[PDB]
Amino acid sequence: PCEKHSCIAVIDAGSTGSRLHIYSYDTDDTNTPIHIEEIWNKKIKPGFASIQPNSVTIDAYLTMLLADAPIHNIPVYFYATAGMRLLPQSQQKKYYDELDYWFRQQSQWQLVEAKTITGNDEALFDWLAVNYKLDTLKSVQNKSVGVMDMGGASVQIVFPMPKNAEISKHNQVELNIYGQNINLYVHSFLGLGQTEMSHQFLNSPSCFANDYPLPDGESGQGNAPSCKEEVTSLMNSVHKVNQQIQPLLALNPVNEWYSIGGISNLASSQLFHFENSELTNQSLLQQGDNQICHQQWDILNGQYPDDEYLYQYCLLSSYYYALMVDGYGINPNQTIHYIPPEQNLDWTIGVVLHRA
Amino acid sequence: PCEKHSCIAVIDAGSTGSRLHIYSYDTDDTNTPIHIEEIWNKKIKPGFASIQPNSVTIDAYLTMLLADAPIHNIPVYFYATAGMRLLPQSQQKKYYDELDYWFRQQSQWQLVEAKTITGNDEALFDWLAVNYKLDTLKSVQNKSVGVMDMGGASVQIVFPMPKNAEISKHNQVELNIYGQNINLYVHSFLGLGQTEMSHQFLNSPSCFANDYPLPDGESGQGNAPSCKEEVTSLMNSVHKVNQQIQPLLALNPVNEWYSIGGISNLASSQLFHFENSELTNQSLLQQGDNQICHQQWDILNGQYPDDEYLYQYCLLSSYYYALMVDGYGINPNQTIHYIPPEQNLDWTIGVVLHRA
Ligand code: NA
Ligand code: NA
Ligand code: NA
């Protein structure tokens, strides 16, 4: 396949593991990739930031990730995300030093770049990946498409916005895709991903089902509106999500919202019911409140003993609402599309489009 | 030594590693331990909550921790703290199931209890340990002693307070030590430990030295008062530290404050100068502001290339001030004693006093 087409490997070194994607593609007369096809996909655990940065450990890890790969001599991008951003730069440097050394010795993998990408770059790739799959990149669009990525340690938001001298250059991207100039606003909130966020609310009774045992000895007494208010304080009083994002969405309205990441998992669980891979925040909060927050934990756990994430669904439904409604200012009745978890839609497609 | 005296093993399964303490002690006629002496101390890495909960991994870990121990057949308490509290109960259960099995097979270690203790219990042990070392437990005291424990994932505060029907039973302890009844208020804030807290402020320029590279591409521009205000929002708007603690300290004044944990490390570094193992918050903030926040990172890093924690000292000095002054309501001019890091003062002494 890499015989008659171009090929690229992109490694997503994420929070819970690393995923190797190998893509074939052709290039059109705008110097933009087309016919992007994933020819190989392998995931290993644990996350890169959770292993020791030495030559023995890195070799085992990278050998495991790449060894069976049926396609050999191709350029590689190794991109780590928020899990690595949480580590001191001096600690990150150890990983990248070892990784450069490992790839040098491999005559079959040509390492182009290995780095911890910013949340802003991640947001750019998120937007490219979704829009590529919706087939909205090829021609100048009537409608504005926004993407929200709901990650473990960070969340990203990205939408079209003309160049603005009053906004940090770090929050703005310019790119040309299929011959058209695009200007995007990008933002990442490090610490507001669901795992990192959750560590501030583990002892909040309003955020767990009735009688759920909290770490410090109290009991769950769930109430989604109360939990949502607690989470909103982290969003707005600490991160100032509302102050930063709402003015920009007011002035640069989004016609269609697409969400990727954790929300797709929650919405696709047996506890929530949504049609057409779409939800509204109003519905999400109401369902979380009724089906989890105000249930008895023992009864709930007995009906669904196989979902290890169930216990968190009161907090998560409250958190998504706090983020989208209280943070981003999205109307509770606004349709939000979520990309089905089973779908071969991954942010690494954006790396192909932008960097291949 | 366990020949003529009682002995107990206490394992502190903490965030960055586990520390085995073996103590000899005698018992006085109030049924209280006396002459508590540490006869063995071993620490291993990493933290218990960071390893896989299976029989092979647990065996290697526990064998490593206990194998060389020169003293054999004695009761063991295995107590995990905030690192384990961050994990789902279902995940914690796997560890404790494996740990029970491992200890059953060892005829030389009699496992009494293995559990994740609450922050409230941790706070109790903190207070007992400090007061044992200050020799203030043996007789009825004129003065009120308070303890603050500044941990990686949680912080604890503990001080005398009579039984109060208006306060959760979980935040109050009754105990009898050296024949005297004691009543303590205990509180733990999970998520407010320095590591967990820091994950919300990694992109805050006010919290890092000038030109320090932040993960999302901006540059440090340190200012301790501004950083302190950011951290205070997490303390008070999210955790409500001020609302919960300040009324209680007003009504139950503390005459002497002792702090353990991270503050001792910061204060004992080459960048800060304090006498008599005492600081004031005013001085801590001023020193952090002048010696780190408003320094050029390149110059600072060049003078102290061996302190891997240096880059965080603007944030940490700001955070301790936010916690003690804006959270707990302590006057910026109030003397705070910190226990020297080199000192053999550990919270596990409290387990001996309370449980042996
Ligand atoms: Na190579
Ligand atoms: Na045993
Ligand atoms: Na965290």
Side-chain angles (χ1 to χ4, degrees), chain A residues 1-343 345-356, chain B residues 1-343 345-356:
Chain A
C2 304
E3 296 295 318
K4 291 261 190 272
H5 314 274
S6 296
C7 285
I8 181 182
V10 184
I11 299 157
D12 168 13
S15 291
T16 60
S18 301
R19 193 177 286 269
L20 166 72
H21 306 259
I22 304 183
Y23 293 104
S24 54
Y25 67 94
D26 301 313
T27 303
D28 78 5
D29 66 4
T30 70
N31 207 0
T32 311
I34 54 172
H35 306 145
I36 302 168
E37 300 281 353
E38 190 171 69
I39 63 176
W40 189 242
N41 187 317
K42 190 177 179 187
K43 193 199 173 172
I44 68 166
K45 290 178 201 169
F48 190 59
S50 80
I51 77 178
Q52 295 300 109
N54 61 57
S55 62
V56 180
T57 307
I58 299 303
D59 172 65
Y61 194 87
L62 291 176
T63 298
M64 193 152 71
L65 184 66
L66 305 171
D68 37 28
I71 286 88
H72 264 297
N73 294 78
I74 65 167
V76 183
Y77 290 78
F78 184 103
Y79 281 169
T81 57
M84 277 289 279
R85 294 183 207 125
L86 298 177
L87 295 181
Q89 180 186 249
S90 64
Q91 194 67 12
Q92 294 189 50
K93 183 165 192 295
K94 299 176 190 184
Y95 289 95
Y96 295 116
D97 289 354
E98 294 299 338
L99 199 140
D100 294 349
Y101 175 62
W102 192 87
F103 275 97
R104 274 205 76 164
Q105 300 173 73
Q106 301 295 75
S107 58
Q108 67 289 349
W109 299 108
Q110 192 209 49
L111 179 69
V112 180
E113 218 166 64
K115 70 194 218 175
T116 301
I117 63 174
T118 62
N120 296 316
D121 290 335
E122 191 178 358
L124 167 57
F125 298 138
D126 290 333
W127 188 88
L128 291 166
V130 174
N131 285 274
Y132 180 85
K133 277 295 201 286
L134 298 172
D135 195 27
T136 56
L137 293 174
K138 255 162 196 153
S139 44
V140 174
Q141 294 284 295
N142 284 347
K143 277 192 167 192
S144 176
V145 179
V147 177
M148 296 172 285
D149 179 3
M150 310 297 199
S154 66
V155 300
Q156 284 70 250
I157 185 171
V158 49
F159 50 89
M161 182 185 177
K163 182 185 216 283
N164 189 331
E166 305 305 328
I167 292 306
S168 172
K169 300 187 184 167
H170 294 100
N171 289 114
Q172 297 183 83
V173 194
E174 297 176 20
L175 69 160
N176 183 289
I177 292 291
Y178 301 121
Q180 78 180 50
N181 286 347
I182 300 170
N183 290 86
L184 305 171
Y185 180 80
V186 288
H187 207 120
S188 185
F189 299 94
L190 186 57
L192 284 189
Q194 67 160 78
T195 305
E196 292 297 303
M197 174 281 297
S198 72
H199 295 170
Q200 302 296 327
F201 303 105
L202 298 182
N203 284 318
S204 293
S206 290
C207 293
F208 297 88
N210 294 332
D211 298 328
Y212 189 76
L214 312 178
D216 290 328
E218 305 286 356
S219 286
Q221 185 161 281
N223 187 245
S226 304
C227 183
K228 172 222 75 169
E229 298 290 349
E230 292 187 46
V231 176
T232 293
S233 297
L234 180 59
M235 302 285 168
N236 291 342
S237 298
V238 179
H239 288 266
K240 316 297 196 298
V241 175
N242 64 338
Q243 298 285 335
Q244 301 187 78
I245 301 303
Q246 295 189 30
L248 299 177
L249 283 174
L251 289 160
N252 307 269
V254 162
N255 304 118
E256 296 178 357
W257 280 112
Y258 286 81
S259 54
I260 57 175
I263 184 160
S264 312
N265 303 307
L266 178 63
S268 308
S269 77
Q270 291 181 295
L271 278 184
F272 293 83
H273 307 303
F274 296 107
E275 286 180 17
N276 200 44
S277 308
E278 292 179 4
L279 58 80
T280 64
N281 277 276
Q282 183 279 328
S283 187
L284 176 62
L285 194 73
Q286 180 163 45
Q287 294 187 54
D289 207 20
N290 292 332
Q291 302 313 312
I292 303 95
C293 303
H294 288 269
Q295 296 285 149
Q296 305 302 303
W297 172 243
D298 276 50
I299 304 183
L300 191 60
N301 184 236
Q303 283 159 18
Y304 307 95
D306 275 318
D307 194 343
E308 62 193 312
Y309 310 103
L310 173 72
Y311 81 97
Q312 221 173 211
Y313 290 170
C314 175
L315 170 62
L316 294 175
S317 61
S318 300
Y319 153 77
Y320 290 134
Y321 188 106
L323 181 55
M324 286 184 274
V325 177
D326 292 348
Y328 301 154
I330 298 169
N331 192 296
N333 304 307
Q334 173 69 41
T335 298
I336 307 298
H337 303 273
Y338 58 89
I339 289 64
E342 302 264 20
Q343 195 159 325
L345 193 155
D346 188 83
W347 71 267
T348 54
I349 291 179
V351 177
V352 180
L353 285 156
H354 189 58
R355 292 298 304 274
Chain B
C2 304
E3 296 295 318
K4 291 261 190 272
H5 314 274
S6 296
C7 285
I8 181 182
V10 184
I11 299 157
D12 168 13
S15 291
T16 60
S18 301
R19 193 177 286 269
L20 166 72
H21 306 259
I22 304 183
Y23 293 104
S24 54
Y25 67 94
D26 301 313
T27 303
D28 78 5
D29 66 4
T30 70
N31 207 0
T32 311
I34 54 172
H35 306 145
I36 302 168
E37 300 281 353
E38 190 171 69
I39 63 176
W40 189 242
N41 187 317
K42 190 177 179 187
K43 193 199 173 172
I44 68 166
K45 290 178 201 169
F48 190 59
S50 80
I51 77 178
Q52 295 300 109
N54 61 57
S55 62
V56 180
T57 307
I58 299 303
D59 172 65
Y61 194 87
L62 291 176
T63 298
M64 193 152 71
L65 184 66
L66 305 171
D68 37 28
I71 286 88
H72 264 297
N73 294 78
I74 65 167
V76 183
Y77 290 78
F78 184 103
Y79 281 169
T81 57
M84 277 289 279
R85 294 183 207 125
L86 298 177
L87 295 181
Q89 180 186 249
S90 64
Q91 194 67 12
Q92 294 189 50
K93 183 165 192 295
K94 299 176 190 184
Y95 289 95
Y96 295 116
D97 289 354
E98 294 299 338
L99 199 140
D100 294 349
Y101 175 63
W102 192 87
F103 275 97
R104 274 205 76 164
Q105 300 173 73
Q106 301 295 75
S107 58
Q108 67 289 349
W109 299 108
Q110 192 209 49
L111 179 69
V112 180
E113 218 166 64
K115 70 194 218 175
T116 301
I117 63 174
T118 62
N120 296 316
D121 290 335
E122 191 178 358
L124 167 57
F125 298 138
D126 290 333
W127 188 88
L128 291 166
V130 174
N131 285 274
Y132 180 85
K133 277 295 201 286
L134 298 172
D135 195 27
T136 56
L137 293 174
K138 255 162 196 153
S139 44
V140 174
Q141 294 284 295
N142 284 347
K143 277 192 167 192
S144 176
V145 179
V147 177
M148 296 172 285
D149 179 3
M150 310 297 199
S154 66
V155 300
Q156 284 70 250
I157 185 171
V158 49
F159 50 89
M161 182 185 177
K163 182 185 216 283
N164 189 331
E166 305 305 328
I167 292 306
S168 172
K169 300 187 184 167
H170 294 100
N171 289 114
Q172 297 183 83
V173 194
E174 297 176 20
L175 69 160
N176 183 289
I177 292 291
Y178 301 121
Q180 78 180 50
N181 286 347
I182 300 170
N183 290 86
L184 305 171
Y185 180 80
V186 288
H187 207 120
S188 185
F189 299 94
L190 186 57
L192 284 189
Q194 67 160 78
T195 305
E196 292 297 303
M197 174 281 297
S198 72
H199 295 170
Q200 302 296 327
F201 303 105
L202 298 182
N203 284 318
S204 293
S206 290
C207 293
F208 297 88
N210 294 332
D211 298 328
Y212 189 76
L214 312 178
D216 290 328
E218 305 286 356
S219 286
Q221 185 161 281
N223 187 245
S226 304
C227 183
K228 172 222 75 169
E229 298 290 349
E230 292 187 46
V231 176
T232 293
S233 297
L234 180 59
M235 302 285 168
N236 291 342
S237 298
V238 179
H239 288 266
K240 316 297 196 298
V241 175
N242 64 338
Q243 298 285 335
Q244 301 187 78
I245 301 303
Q246 295 189 30
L248 299 177
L249 283 174
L251 289 160
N252 307 269
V254 162
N255 304 118
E256 296 178 357
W257 280 112
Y258 286 81
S259 54
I260 57 175
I263 184 160
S264 312
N265 303 307
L266 178 63
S268 308
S269 77
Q270 291 181 295
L271 278 184
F272 293 83
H273 307 303
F274 296 107
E275 286 180 17
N276 200 44
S277 308
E278 292 179 4
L279 58 80
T280 64
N281 277 276
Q282 183 279 328
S283 187
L284 176 62
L285 194 73
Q286 180 163 45
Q287 294 187 54
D289 207 20
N290 292 332
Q291 303 313 312
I292 303 95
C293 303
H294 288 269
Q295 296 285 149
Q296 305 302 303
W297 172 243
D298 276 50
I299 304 183
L300 191 60
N301 184 236
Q303 283 159 18
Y304 307 95
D306 275 318
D307 194 343
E308 62 193 312
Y309 310 103
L310 173 72
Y311 81 97
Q312 221 173 211
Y313 290 170
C314 175
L315 170 62
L316 294 175
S317 61
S318 300
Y319 153 77
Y320 290 134
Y321 188 106
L323 181 55
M324 286 184 274
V325 177
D326 292 348
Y328 301 154
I330 298 169
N331 192 296
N333 304 307
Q334 173 69 41
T335 298
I336 307 298
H337 303 273
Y338 58 89
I339 289 64
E342 302 264 20
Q343 195 159 325
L345 193 155
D346 188 83
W347 71 267
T348 54
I349 291 179
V351 177
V352 180
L353 285 156
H354 189 58
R355 292 298 304 274

mmCIF file of all heavy atoms in Angstrom, chain B residues 102-111, ligand 2:
data_model
loop_
_atom_site.group_PDB
_atom_site.id
_atom_site.type_symbol
_atom_site.label_atom_id
_atom_site.label_comp_id
_atom_site.label_asym_id
_atom_site.label_seq_id
_atom_site.Cartn_x
_atom_site.Cartn_y
_atom_site.Cartn_z
ATOM 1 N N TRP B 102 -1.070 -12.083 49.940
ATOM 2 C CA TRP B 102 0.378 -12.063 50.149
ATOM 3 C C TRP B 102 0.736 -12.238 51.630
ATOM 4 O O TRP B 102 1.597 -13.062 51.972
ATOM 5 C CB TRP B 102 1.015 -10.781 49.584
ATOM 6 C CG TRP B 102 2.512 -10.898 49.542
ATOM 7 C CD1 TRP B 102 3.254 -11.427 48.529
ATOM 8 C CD2 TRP B 102 3.451 -10.511 50.569
ATOM 9 N NE1 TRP B 102 4.591 -11.387 48.851
ATOM 10 C CE2 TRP B 102 4.742 -10.840 50.098
ATOM 11 C CE3 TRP B 102 3.321 -9.929 51.844
ATOM 12 C CZ2 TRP B 102 5.910 -10.588 50.842
ATOM 13 C CZ3 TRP B 102 4.483 -9.680 52.591
ATOM 14 C CH2 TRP B 102 5.763 -10.013 52.081
ATOM 15 N N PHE B 103 0.078 -11.482 52.503
ATOM 16 C CA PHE B 103 0.394 -11.547 53.942
ATOM 17 C C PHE B 103 -0.012 -12.863 54.594
ATOM 18 O O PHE B 103 0.681 -13.345 55.489
ATOM 19 C CB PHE B 103 -0.205 -10.364 54.696
ATOM 20 C CG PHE B 103 0.666 -9.143 54.663
ATOM 21 C CD1 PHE B 103 0.430 -8.135 53.734
ATOM 22 C CD2 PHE B 103 1.752 -9.009 55.537
ATOM 23 C CE1 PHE B 103 1.238 -7.006 53.681
ATOM 24 C CE2 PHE B 103 2.569 -7.871 55.494
ATOM 25 C CZ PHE B 103 2.307 -6.871 54.566
ATOM 26 N N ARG B 104 -1.116 -13.456 54.133
ATOM 27 C CA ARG B 104 -1.545 -14.772 54.632
ATOM 28 C C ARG B 104 -0.438 -15.812 54.509
ATOM 29 O O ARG B 104 -0.239 -16.657 55.402
ATOM 30 C CB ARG B 104 -2.772 -15.278 53.868
ATOM 31 C CG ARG B 104 -4.097 -14.784 54.413
ATOM 32 C CD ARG B 104 -5.232 -15.742 54.070
ATOM 33 N NE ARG B 104 -5.208 -16.935 54.920
ATOM 34 C CZ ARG B 104 -6.218 -17.793 55.058
ATOM 35 N NH1 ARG B 104 -7.366 -17.619 54.396
ATOM 36 N NH2 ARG B 104 -6.078 -18.837 55.865
ATOM 37 N N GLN B 105 0.287 -15.751 53.402
ATOM 38 C CA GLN B 105 1.324 -16.757 53.124
ATOM 39 C C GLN B 105 2.596 -16.541 53.923
ATOM 40 O O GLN B 105 3.440 -17.418 53.973
ATOM 41 C CB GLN B 105 1.684 -16.753 51.657
ATOM 42 C CG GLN B 105 0.528 -17.065 50.738
ATOM 43 C CD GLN B 105 0.935 -16.860 49.304
ATOM 44 O OE1 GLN B 105 1.687 -17.661 48.734
ATOM 45 N NE2 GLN B 105 0.462 -15.772 48.713
ATOM 46 N N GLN B 106 2.741 -15.362 54.519
ATOM 47 C CA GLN B 106 3.938 -15.023 55.287
ATOM 48 C C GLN B 106 3.698 -15.303 56.759
ATOM 49 O O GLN B 106 2.909 -14.606 57.416
ATOM 50 C CB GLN B 106 4.272 -13.544 55.111
ATOM 51 C CG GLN B 106 4.520 -13.109 53.674
ATOM 52 C CD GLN B 106 5.751 -13.755 53.064
ATOM 53 O OE1 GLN B 106 5.736 -14.929 52.705
ATOM 54 N NE2 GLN B 106 6.818 -12.985 52.931
ATOM 55 N N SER B 107 4.389 -16.307 57.284
ATOM 56 C CA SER B 107 4.188 -16.724 58.662
ATOM 57 C C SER B 107 4.884 -15.779 59.653
ATOM 58 O O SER B 107 4.666 -15.865 60.862
ATOM 59 C CB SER B 107 4.693 -18.151 58.842
ATOM 60 O OG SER B 107 6.056 -18.212 58.483
ATOM 61 N N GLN B 108 5.700 -14.870 59.130
ATOM 62 C CA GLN B 108 6.482 -13.947 59.961
ATOM 63 C C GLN B 108 5.865 -12.537 60.109
ATOM 64 O O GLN B 108 6.272 -11.767 60.974
ATOM 65 C CB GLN B 108 7.953 -13.897 59.480
ATOM 66 C CG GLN B 108 8.193 -13.278 58.101
ATOM 67 C CD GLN B 108 7.702 -14.122 56.924
ATOM 68 O OE1 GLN B 108 7.345 -15.293 57.072
ATOM 69 N NE2 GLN B 108 7.694 -13.517 55.740
ATOM 70 N N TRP B 109 4.883 -12.203 59.280
ATOM 71 C CA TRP B 109 4.228 -10.900 59.381
ATOM 72 C C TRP B 109 2.763 -11.133 59.674
ATOM 73 O O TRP B 109 2.086 -11.784 58.881
ATOM 74 C CB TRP B 109 4.361 -10.135 58.060
ATOM 75 C CG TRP B 109 5.787 -9.849 57.639
ATOM 76 C CD1 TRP B 109 6.480 -10.438 56.613
ATOM 77 C CD2 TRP B 109 6.677 -8.889 58.225
ATOM 78 N NE1 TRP B 109 7.751 -9.912 56.537
ATOM 79 C CE2 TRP B 109 7.897 -8.959 57.513
ATOM 80 C CE3 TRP B 109 6.565 -7.986 59.294
ATOM 81 C CZ2 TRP B 109 9.004 -8.154 57.831
ATOM 82 C CZ3 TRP B 109 7.670 -7.178 59.609
ATOM 83 C CH2 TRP B 109 8.870 -7.272 58.878
ATOM 84 N N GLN B 110 2.265 -10.622 60.801
ATOM 85 C CA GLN B 110 0.855 -10.795 61.127
ATOM 86 C C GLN B 110 0.083 -9.535 60.740
ATOM 87 O O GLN B 110 0.094 -8.539 61.477
ATOM 88 C CB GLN B 110 0.656 -11.114 62.612
ATOM 89 C CG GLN B 110 -0.761 -11.578 62.935
ATOM 90 C CD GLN B 110 -1.203 -11.237 64.351
ATOM 91 O OE1 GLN B 110 -1.063 -10.094 64.808
ATOM 92 N NE2 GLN B 110 -1.762 -12.226 65.047
ATOM 93 N N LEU B 111 -0.579 -9.572 59.587
ATOM 94 C CA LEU B 111 -1.276 -8.383 59.092
ATOM 95 C C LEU B 111 -2.505 -8.116 59.954
ATOM 96 O O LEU B 111 -3.393 -8.966 60.057
ATOM 97 C CB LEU B 111 -1.674 -8.539 57.616
ATOM 98 C CG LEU B 111 -2.435 -7.330 57.016
ATOM 99 C CD1 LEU B 111 -1.510 -6.121 56.896
ATOM 100 C CD2 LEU B 111 -3.035 -7.669 55.653
HETATM 101 NA NA NA C 2 0.700 -13.766 58.044
#
